[PDB]
């Protein structure tokens, strides 16, 4: 090696590499972009989905109707000829949500009495979070013990009676329903997340502040997934009464931004929610990407003239800071969504600030528009709504209109011409220059913020497609029969609206992206029209061509190994010839048959081509291949049993002997002519004790059911002796369900598909990823959950005569449970349901214990609720405590 000629070169290369890596790390840490994944909104008018919001923006209407009437407001003495009279408002209209009164308490675990004390804000936030999680494709139950920060912007307000006076039914829950801290704690508790939970209140800029904090937390790497939004729903007209005192409200209640007829900013209400993640992680996991956030800035006006009046210097400084943080020049923004409050004094100041920030150096005319013209001021719900509108219109490539802007304000200069009002829709086609936009939000406290939004990278293009022949099952779940029917009807309607879909795509979308709720229905489709008929039948309420079953807390399955019976064995076609797992699970066992039979995969086909000494090895091969296929498809047994010839297969699947070595060692003579239950001894045995010396059905199955497994998978080409198993199951304990793998005369893969459908309907856990290892199917948007809402609102002894005694005890227990939980309809509560999902806590637990003790005059342990989570268990325990 040449001294001082080559040695230094390697060191220089290493140093350059390290410097490049360090600078890349600095750049990534400082300003990594964040991507927007999901979308959720609840806006005035008929808006319930972002698509409806985009439709409203496109047609250009307004959602100002008038004051509501469900909240029980006086609505009469709210106005008077004298505006100075106490308790008098000024606004005679505005956009108000009509769904704040209704709620679904049963879907989550919450007692109705507790639900009656819940603020509408956190009431809506749960639904928004669930919808935004479902839309992104991530199943809600998947996110457990994972870092997922939550940030919500709210305003305290007031809902019910004062704490000091108290109530009658709601006494111990007035806190947790009427505070701002729990607004994110409730979501975290329901979803089981572990990321930070923060509630922030900064007047009208709360949503923007929350999204800025979420972006910072994502950038620092503290949390891998973020969730931000805002909400503002008022139940009392006191806010309008107060805001009428300084006369800052327009009479009609319409916002006219930058117009000549400014009178006020009105009022409205709404909510919004976003899901965020850094671009690299989103790309790695293949999550959908809609747009990219780059930079934000937060600032306060400081010592402004008075308290309410804003300042222009702070706005200019924050705009410049936001532009410089993301490294985007002032001449690289096509449109700006202004505050657009429509007040008399704010508009000239905002216009001058915008001219200073952008219009001073402009080549192309900037497009200006305000969303508050269509909806009115939404308090904390603003800001995020502007971002939603910007991303929607920028995805659609069309700039929406602005109402009541035909008369520009005279106090604002327009001679420069660098700023153009959006009086008409403007096309926004994609081009070489990436599209960008900016939003702003100024509150009454003084804090103001700004942000920059950019279009998604054009890398999604390049998708390939490929046809196929295997039909994938269709599944859907709900929380109640009515929910199931509504979900089926909605799916059918949506499919009717959008034709030309791919069955594989829909099956893939429905397989992953929905929770495993305890009301299941599944089937296998053949046509886009026949599936419509099946869905219509499901919506009507009759199960035809589909498997329907209800099962909760039942997820383990058990294989059963019978003897002979499917001697037709005509399914030698396909499977090992088509199914990759069945193909790979047949030869190695067949290779074990070579020692004394020379009986490989091909001679099985040639033997059939259309003596127990040769049926037994092929029976064992079929058993092991089917077991391998099932275990590869995600379902694994909790136990296994065998017939006279099934013990060999049981040992093979238990690990007693090797995969192929088990074959020709138990069958060394070759004709003789997992925790599992030893059928010969009727007890569980280890795989080790099985040897050469080793070589009551009702009792075995009843013991297995007592152990805690309530289903069996019958692995065979034909169902055999299943009726006896069902009869024994009915005669002891709960119902015992069994499903055959295949039926004689039907060797098609559709039989396996419907078998999988029945297994899913039986509550058996299925790994859908193995089913969709690869087919050429991608995600397709689908409708969300059809909640079932109802109106909630506050305003400011025998001596063992017979088992009939047992039913009496059960009925009185049911009545007491209905009474304590606040269920007004004291007619029915779920029987198999436990108590943790009914919303009963310690406060109600001790009251129920005292009621039961007083009713029957017995002493009952405090922790009995833990001992007997079910009403049936408690009834059985108490009926055995007699005498």
């Amino acid at each position, epitope marked *: *090696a*040449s*001294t*001082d*000629s*080559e*040695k*230094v070169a*390697e*060191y220089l*290369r*290493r*140093a350059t*590499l*390290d410097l490049r*890596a*360090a600078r890349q790390r600095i750049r990534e840490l400082e300003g990594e972009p964040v991507a927007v994944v999901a979308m959720a909104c609840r806006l005035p008018g008929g808006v319930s989905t972002p698509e409806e919001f985009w439709e409203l923006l496109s047609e250009g209407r307004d959602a100002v109707a008038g004051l509501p009437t469900d909240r029980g407001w006086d609505l009469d003495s709210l106005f008077h000829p004298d505006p100075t009279r106490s308790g008098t408002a000024h606004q005679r209209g505005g956009g108000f949500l009509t769904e704040a009164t209704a709620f679904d308490p049963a879907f989550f675990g919450m007692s109705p009495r507790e639900a009656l004390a819940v603020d509408p804000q956190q009431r809506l936030m749960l639904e928004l979070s669930w919808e935004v999680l479902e839309r992104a494709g991530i199943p809600p139950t998947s996110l457990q013990a994972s870092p997922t920060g939550v940030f919500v912007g709210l305003i305290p307000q007031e809902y019910g009676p004062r704490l000091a006076e108290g109530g009658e039914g709601v006494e111990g829950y007035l806190m947790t329903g009427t505070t701002t801290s729990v607004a994110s704690g409730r979501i975290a508790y329901t979803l089981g997340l572990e990321g930070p939970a923060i509630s922030v209140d900064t007047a009208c800029s709360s949503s923007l502040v929350a999204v800025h904090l979420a972006c910072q937390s994502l950038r620092r790497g503290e949390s891998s997934l973020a969730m931000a939004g805002g909400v503002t729903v008022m139940p009392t007209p006191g806010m309008l009464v107060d805001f009428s005192r300084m006369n800052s409200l327009a009479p009609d209640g319409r916002c006219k931004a930058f117009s000549a007829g400014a009178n006020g900013f009105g009022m409205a209400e709404g909510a919004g929610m976003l899901l965020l993640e850094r671009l690299s992680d989103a790309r790695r996991n293949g999550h959908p990407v809609l747009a990219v956030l780059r930079g934000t800035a937060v600032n306060s006006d400081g010592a402004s003239n008075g308290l309410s009046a804003p300042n222009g210097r702070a706005q200019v400084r924050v705009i410049q800071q936001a532009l410089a943080e993301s490294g985007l020049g002032p001449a690289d923004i096509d449109a700006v969504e202004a505050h657009g409050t429509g007040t008399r004094l704010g508009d000239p100041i905002e216009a001058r600030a915008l001219f200073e920030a952008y219009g001073r150096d402009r080549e192309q005319p900037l497009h200006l528009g305000s969303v508050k013209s269509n909806l009115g001021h939404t308090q904390a719900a603003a800001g995020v709504a502007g971002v939603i509108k910007m991303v929607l219109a920028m995805r659609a490539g069309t700039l929406p209109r602005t109402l009541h802007a035909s008369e520009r304000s005279k106090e604002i200069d327009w001679s420069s011409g660098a700023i153009s009002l959006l009086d008409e829709p403007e096309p926004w086609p994609a081009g070489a220059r990436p599209r960008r936009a900016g939003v702003s939000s100024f509150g009454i406290s003084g804090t103001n913020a700004h942000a920059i939004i950019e279009e998604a990278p054009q890398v999604v293009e390049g998708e390939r497609v490929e046809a196929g022949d295997v039909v994938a099952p269709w599944v859907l779940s709900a929380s109640s029969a009515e929910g199931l029917r509504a979900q089926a009807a909605r799916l059918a309607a949506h499919l009717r609206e959008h034709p030309g879909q791919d069955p594989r795509d829909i099956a893939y979308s429905l397989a992953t992206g929905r929770a495993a709720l305890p009301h299941r229905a599944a089937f296998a489709p053949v046509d886009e029209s026949a599936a419509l008929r099946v869905l219509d039948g499901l919506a009507t309420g009759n199960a035809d061509g589909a498997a329907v079953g209800t099962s909760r807390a039942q997820q383990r399955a058990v294989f059963v190994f019978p003897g002979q019976g499917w001697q037709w064995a005509g399914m030698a076609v396909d499977l090992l010839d088509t199914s990759p797992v069945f193909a790979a699970a047949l030869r190695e066992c067949a290779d074990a048959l070579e020692p004394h039979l020379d009986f490989e995969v091909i001679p099985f086909l040639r033997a059939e081509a259309a003596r127990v000494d040769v049926v037994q090895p092929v029976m064992f091969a079929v058993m092991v291949s089917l077991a391998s296929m099932w275990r590869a498809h995600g379902v694994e047994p909790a136990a296994v049993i065998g017939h006279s010839q099934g013990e060999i297969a049981a040992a093979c699947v238990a690990g007693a002997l090797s995969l192929d070595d088990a074959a020709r060692v138990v069958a060394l003579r070759s004709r003789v002519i997992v925790p599992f239950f030893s059928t010969v001894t009727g007890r569980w045995t280890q795989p080790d004790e099985l040897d050469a010396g080793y070589w009551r059905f009702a009792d075995a199955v009843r013991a297995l059911a007592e152990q805690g497994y309530r289903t069996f998978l019958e692995v065979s080409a034909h169902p055999i002796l299943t009726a006896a198993i069902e009869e024994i199951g009915d005669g002891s304990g709960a119902d015992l369900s069994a499903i055959h793998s295949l039926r004689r005369g039907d060797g098609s893969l559709a039989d396996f598909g419907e078998a999988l459908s029945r297994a899913f309907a039986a509550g058996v856990a299925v790994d859908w990823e193995s089913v969709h290892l690869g087919t050429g199917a991608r995600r397709v948007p689908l409708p969300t959950y059809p909640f079932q809402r109802e109106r909630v609102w506050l305003e400011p002894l025998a001596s063992l005569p017979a088992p009939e005694r047992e039913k009496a005890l059960f009925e009185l227990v049911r009545s007491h449970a209905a009474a304590v939980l606040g269920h007004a309809s004291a007619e029915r509560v779920p029987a198999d349901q436990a108590f943790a999902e009914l919303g009963v806590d310690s406060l109600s637990a001790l009251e129920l214990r005292n009621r039961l003790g007083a009713a029957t005059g017995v002493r009952l342990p405090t922790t009995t609720v833990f001992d007997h989570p079910d009403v049936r268990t408690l009834a059985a325990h108490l009926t055995s405590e007699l005498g």
Partner: antibody
Amino acid sequence: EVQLVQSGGGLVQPGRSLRLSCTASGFTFGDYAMSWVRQAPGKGLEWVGFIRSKAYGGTTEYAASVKGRFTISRDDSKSIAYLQMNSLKTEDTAVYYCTRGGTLFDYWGQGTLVTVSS
Amino acid sequence: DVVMTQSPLSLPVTPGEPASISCRSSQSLLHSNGYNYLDWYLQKPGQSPQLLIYLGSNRASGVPDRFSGSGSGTDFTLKISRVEAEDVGVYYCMQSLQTPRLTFGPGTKVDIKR
């Protein structure tokens, strides 16, 4: 990223012949210089050979107990290094490594057993 | 041209507190350019060797910040901060004045104190 893999290895009787393939990807292979090291099964690490780069041209030098025993080979079309085996000896039974750099031993390979017996 | 670690060959360690490995050399290196041609290597049990620090103390990327070299041209010593799990194996002192290097050296073992 930069990956190095090695292939070629098994049981060979004394006096046989063999070759070893080192595969590089993720960087401009031309500049760097390859080097082969060998660790005895239960001893330290001893350097074997080092091939220079075509920028300086040059060749290897090997060392004692290996000079005149077997040679190296290096390509440029697919960046595959070759170590030849000639008249293998039982004492040569040891794991072999291929690594980047001639003096500063940077990112290494994965190793190969390569046993010799009869 | 002859360098031996001279550090405790066993050097039992226990997590929490830090440690150090001395590396005494022959006549100092001090190349005219103003550097010391000494490197460090670490071998995990049953793993491929990896580089830790090249000339002086400028530990390369990927290496955790808990490692830090130091020393003059004839009294090199490697400092390790708070000790954690693993890091048990063989550490090697490597010179660069003589190109035809034959053997890395006996090295110093690392194991948990008991």
